[PDB]
Amino acid sequence: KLVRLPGLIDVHVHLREPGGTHKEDFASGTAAALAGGITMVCAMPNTRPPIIDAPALALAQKLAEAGARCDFALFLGASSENAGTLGTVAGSAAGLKLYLNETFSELRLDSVVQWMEHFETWPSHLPIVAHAEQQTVAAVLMVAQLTQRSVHICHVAQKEEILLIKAAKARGLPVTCEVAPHHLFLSHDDLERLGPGKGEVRPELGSRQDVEALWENMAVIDCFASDHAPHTLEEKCGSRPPPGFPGLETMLPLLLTAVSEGRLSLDDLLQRLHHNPRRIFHLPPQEDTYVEVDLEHEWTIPSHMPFSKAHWTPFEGQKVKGTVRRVVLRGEVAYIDGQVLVPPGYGQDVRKWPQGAVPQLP
């Protein structure tokens, strides 16, 4: 007996097209998504060229419409130069992404005044998300309060971060957050196995006490999102390894294992991979779309998953219970037992759907 789930949403993926297509492209990344039970993804803008203006957005849109196998929205990225220039295209993007620390990106904002300018000029009804580690979470929350609007915090990893967000919610402040699976299922205890190259990620892996704090404060976590960040093994094992893990194909199996162990409920899971992603980002429903999972199947994660071009995974050797058996997307069978069955280009930009626009005042 299978369980039917709605079409799950991952609001934080890196599909590397344009400019890094040896790591992943729209076609391979969305195949990995479907294989992990994900039918809609929001793609980050730290590509080459980065999606920081209208021409780059236009290019990315066509590449995604031609290559994506599942549906998608594309983030715009904040730069030191583009505040106040995105108003005509802002509504066509998933939202605006701010890079406030040193990760795999050059979209550096070198002053909190630049953060303020983006919060003041980006349309107030559209989403803003921030890469903000440790004390940076408090700093960007200050900027959100000074400009009287909401903010969403990407991949929360540490006790310090989730407790701060918890205190902000208790004061009624409009903040939401997401947590990625490696920060719930990996810790410093795993760095000896992974090694210093494979183990590079931002935010870095936390302590066992960080992981325990995230689980203890599950009520504070609005979304799960993979931060699918594919790099090749050659890159991860080389002299200057880039940070990030692939994760689309492993996220739901890991979380289903936790559900079967009683660590969280099926509803807890569906709030965080469907309902809350919808409502925070104003993402539309998907007609005739659902995911069938088998909760009984026990298996061990191999050295690489079938679809991501990253061709490695930090969860190798972990035992999981639960697997994706079939995915239907808008009335067509998209995935069955390891075979993707919709071609590149089947996926659509959900912000072009009439129901996919963010409502605003005239």
Add this chain to the structure above:
Amino acid sequence: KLVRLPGLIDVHVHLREPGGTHKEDFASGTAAALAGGITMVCAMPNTRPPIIDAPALALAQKLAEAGARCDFALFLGASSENAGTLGTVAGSAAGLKLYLNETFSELRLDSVVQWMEHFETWPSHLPIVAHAEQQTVAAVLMVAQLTQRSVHICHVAQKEEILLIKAAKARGLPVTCEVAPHHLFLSHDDLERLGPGKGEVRPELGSRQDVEALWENMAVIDCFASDHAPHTLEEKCGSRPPPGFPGLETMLPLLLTAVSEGRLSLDDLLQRLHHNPRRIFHLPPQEDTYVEVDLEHEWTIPSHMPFSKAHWTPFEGQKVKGTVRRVVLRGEVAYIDGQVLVPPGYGQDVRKWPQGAVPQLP
């Protein structure tokens, strides 16, 4: 220029059929819903006969399928006799409703042990909602904790109640709540105008400080819901007046006025009348469904609204800004400028849709 909204959801309405059809029936109540921009309603079980067993549910389902003009789900009601007997039909209902105080109902539970039995026997993945006033909110929250599950609190009205729920959420407890428009827009200051008959409602109208506390703690309010409780003027003005107000046709106009005044944002409104109702009750999307409102139109609420058989309203004389211009439901024009255009029976039971079942473990 109109604003397009998604199909709004009211999770707390009384449509009085079967048994009280002089107050309202499915056809008149759902016409009032469409006129107020509501495309799906959840109907309470305190009818005559009350919906407290499988035969009564079957009857109510057919009456709704034949009379409803918008889509719907039907609550089951908890009784002193039916704990442990609803398992075969539980999944077909919106949820289980507990009447824990003395309102317009005989579904009296005369012991917290009966509350415990319902929390233990109702399927753990399906919704439970409670009419729970003042200290009863704390008592039912205790029962939810003892049985390790969630609860939803109906029409929160007082500072005491919202602050208690706020403290529970700060402790991570799984509780949600709804607030009705009369407790945001009416107070003791209005009882002299209404009089003791028309003014009877449960929970009773609060003080100006109660109303200010609800607005101050908007972040704690998960849903708006009308508690549409129609009674005739003869009944409200008679010797033994029943409690309750009609409200489907006035709820969105009142809230749109508040939005135009800057008291809350359009997003705040759509979280509470669309996204959170969906996710708390696992209600499915509605294809090709939307509501067009005009935010500029200023008008005064008359002595009765066009569609509810209650033929009165406690908001008479209040000035509002905002009106529903057009509603489309599953591809058909359902309402335009005061004319309902879908017939009785157009509406469907959303729990029969494949996407409308609540997911559960096998």
